[PDB]
Each structure stands twice: as C-alpha cells, then as structure tokens.
C-alpha cells in the first residue's frame, strides 16, 4: 500500500542501443547484448551535411528504410528519420544446403535492383610542409624526366597543380596528389641522383585494392598557412557473397550463395524471398523475438500500420495471429512454398515474411589478401605486418 513513487515506464531502463531491439522481453539477454554491440557499426545515414564534409571512411546506404515492428523509443532516437538498414523478405528454410551454419541465400534479381547497396567515401588528406624554409614541398605534376624516386603509377589523371579533378574515374596504384620535395646534389647521390638534379617524388597514391570515382577535392590553407588539400572518392559496394549481414536479434552471418528469381522458391501468390536463413539458428540461440518481429512485420506490411514493438506492453502472440488470420494468410506465419528448380510443392510449409536487416562494416573486399614474395622489414628482415603494406 505504501507506494511512494511510480515508474514512468519500464522500457526506459534500457540504453540507446537496446532500444532498437523489437520485443527484447521475448529474447534472451546475451542476444540483446550482441545486438547492442552490432548496432554501433551498421551502415546508415548519420547526418545530412555529408555532402559538404570531408569525413574519412564513410558508408551511406542507397535506400534506407524504417522498420515495421518499431519501438516507441525510436521516436525519441530519430531512427525513423535516419534508419540504418532495410526490410527484406526473409524465408526460414533448409533449401539447397547453402544456408547451413548461419549462412544466407540472397536473391540476385533483388541485388541488381539496388538492395543493401551502399556508398563508401574515402578521404585522402595531403599537406605540403617547410622544414627550415630552405626546403619547400610543392604540389605539382612530376615529370618523368627530372623526378627521381617516382612511383610506377600513372600520372595522366593529374592536372597542372598536381591534383585530380573530381569526376575522373580512378583505380588502385593511381596517384591522386602529386607532391615533390627538393633535394641536394651532395647529400645522397644515390643511383641516378646526380643526373636527375631536380627533385624527388613524394606523392600520395590511392590504395592498391581500391577503385572508384573522385567525388570532391578541396584546397585550403590550415592554421599556420600551409596549403593542404583534401580528397574524397566515392565507390558503390554491391553486396557480394563475402559481405556480412546482421539483424535486430543478435543474428549475424554472411551470404552463402546468390540465386535468381527462377532459382528461388516462391509462394502461391508470387512473392519471392530476398533472403533465406537456416532454421538451426533459432533453437540454439533461443531468440523467439526474431519470429515475432517477422510475424508482426507481416501483419504491419498487410494492414499498413507499423506495429508497436515496445518491450513491456500487453501485445501477445495470439492477437497477432488473429490479426494475420483476418488478412487471409496462415495465423502461424507458415505459407505453402514451391520449389524453384522443379516447380513442385514443398512437403513442409516455410516460415515466410519480411524482417528488418542491417549491413555491417565487415566486408570481404577489405579482408582478402595474399602475399607471395614481398617487402621485408628493416629490423628483422621478415615479412611486414599489415594488409596495406602487403604483409604476410
């Protein structure tokens, strides 16, 4: 009886990252922790002024979409205005065996139409400096006649000031900013230094494995008046097999293989799944919320009203089953699917419905590397460390 105070709402006990979770009550805690950790690295749109900024390593998704099973706290977190993922039609089945061990099969026709495609903006900042005023670095186009220590990259994309104008398609091993340093004749005299006489190359090329289109280039004097230049190159990264994807329940995994529409199973109505996952994910991980978000997301996709996915409410599973039953589909989320290769009906009905997914920073194009006789360290004369330095 002696209740002195009352809680405003229990769902406020969670943090920012856990607030994005739909129905975390029906999910185990370590999955809420894993999802709270994966929510700090998914692709999305952080701000709108990215067109006038020079941030390093940016990733802006093409078609950001707000989820269906939304939590009220998202209204206070600006998630509907700046979502970090896309809703994808997902089926839960053991198709051609390419789904085992957290593997996913993605529709190729959906990828070709722009699904989970994102942009990556890499900024290369260079600056000329003066040591004791006698030696002055200068941004210019190095000539292959008098410049020593010149990289083997091409210098046809540079202008007269030693920079690449935006819009020029560049690839790896390409010099973006040409900078030369003055040298002394009686200081080194190494190899042909007594013949080039002039200067030494010290340009900053693009990464070896990178490629794209230069987005924006700007030149400005810094604090002490040194003329520095910032470059920003954009590159669309189409979802590949080696790319990783996560959801809002701790479920993470890469793509197993990509099939086309005629190779994907289809229902009697004609909706093709954009992503299929392995059933064996569910029982072990004991994430029941991943199914409730798919069911409520289907009811929200049919009725046209975004379902409330708050933690502590009075929404039960039977009510969502009744609301889905009112729309004509099966109340338990199952739906009769047909094979893609033979066109024959499957014996077991497939759990089929949309689910909100997110794309993580981890991609295969920034992981695969092979070394066969490369550069060695100066100390131990052993292969170096790091992928950018061509290390073993």
């Amino acid at each position: 009886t002696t209740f002195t105070h009352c809680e405003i709402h229990p769902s406020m006990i969670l943090g920012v990252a856990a607030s994005i979770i739909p129905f975390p009550d029906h999910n185990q805690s370590p999955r809420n922790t894993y999802q709270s950790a994966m929510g700090k690295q998914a692709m999305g749109v952080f701000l709108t002024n990215y067109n006038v900024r020079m941030d390093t390593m940016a990733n802006i998704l093409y078609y950001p979409q707000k989820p269906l099973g939304t939590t009220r706290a998202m209204e206070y977190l600006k998630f509907r205005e700046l979502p970090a993922g896309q809703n994808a039609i997902v089926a839960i089945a053991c198709y051609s065996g390419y789904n085992q061990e957290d593997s996913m099969i993605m529709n190729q026709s959906s990828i070709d139409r722009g699904l989970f495609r994102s942009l990556f903006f890499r900024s290369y900042m260079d600056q000329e400096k003066k040591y004791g005023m006698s030696i002055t670095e200068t941004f210019e186009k190095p000539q292959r006649t008098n410049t020593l220590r010149m990289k083997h990259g091409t210098y046809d994309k540079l202008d007269d000031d030693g920079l690449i104008a935006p819009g020029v398609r560049v690839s790896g091993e390409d010099v973006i900013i040409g900078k030369t340093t003055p040298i002394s004749p009686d200081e080194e005299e190494l190899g042909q230094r007594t013949a080039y006489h002039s200067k030494r190359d010290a340009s900053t090329p693009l990464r070896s494995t990178e490629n794209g289109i230069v987005d924006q280039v700007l030149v400005t004097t810094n604090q002490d008046g040194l003329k520095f230049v910032k470059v920003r190159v954009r590159t669309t990264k189409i979802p590949q097999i080696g790319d990783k994807f996560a959801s809002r329940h701790g479920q993470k995994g890469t793509i197993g293989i990509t099939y086309r529409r005629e190779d994907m199973p289809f229902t009697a109505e004609g909706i093709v799944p954009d992503l299929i996952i392995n059933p064996h994910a569910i029982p072990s991980r004991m994430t029941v919320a991943h199914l409730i978000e798919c069911l409520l997301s289907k009811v929200a996709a049919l009725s046209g009203n975004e379902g409330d996915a708050s933690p502590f409410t009075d929404i039960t599973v039977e009510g969502i089953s009744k609301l889905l039953r009112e729309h004509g589909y099966q109340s338990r989320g199952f739906e009769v699917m047909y094979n893609g290769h033979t066109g024959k009906k499957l014996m077991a009905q497939i759990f089929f419905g949309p689910t909100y997914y997110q794309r993580l920073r981890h991609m295969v194009d920034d992981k695969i590397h092979a070394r066969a006789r490369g550069p060695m360290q100066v100390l131990t004369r052993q292969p170096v460390e790091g992928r950018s330095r061509d290390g073993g």
């Binding site: 009220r72 409520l296 009811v299 009725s303 009203n305 379902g307 969502i320």
Partner: peptide, 15 residues
C-alpha cells in the same frame, strides 16, 4: 497492436 501515429488528426479533431 500497432503504433498509433495518427494522433495529430485525433488531437486536432478533439481540441
């Protein structure tokens, strides 16, 4: 069971 986002018309029609 869905998020009521049409409260602007209800508040405008009630006040």
């Amino acid at each position: 069971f869905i998020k009521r986002d049409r409260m602007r018309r209800n508040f405008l029609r009630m006040r």
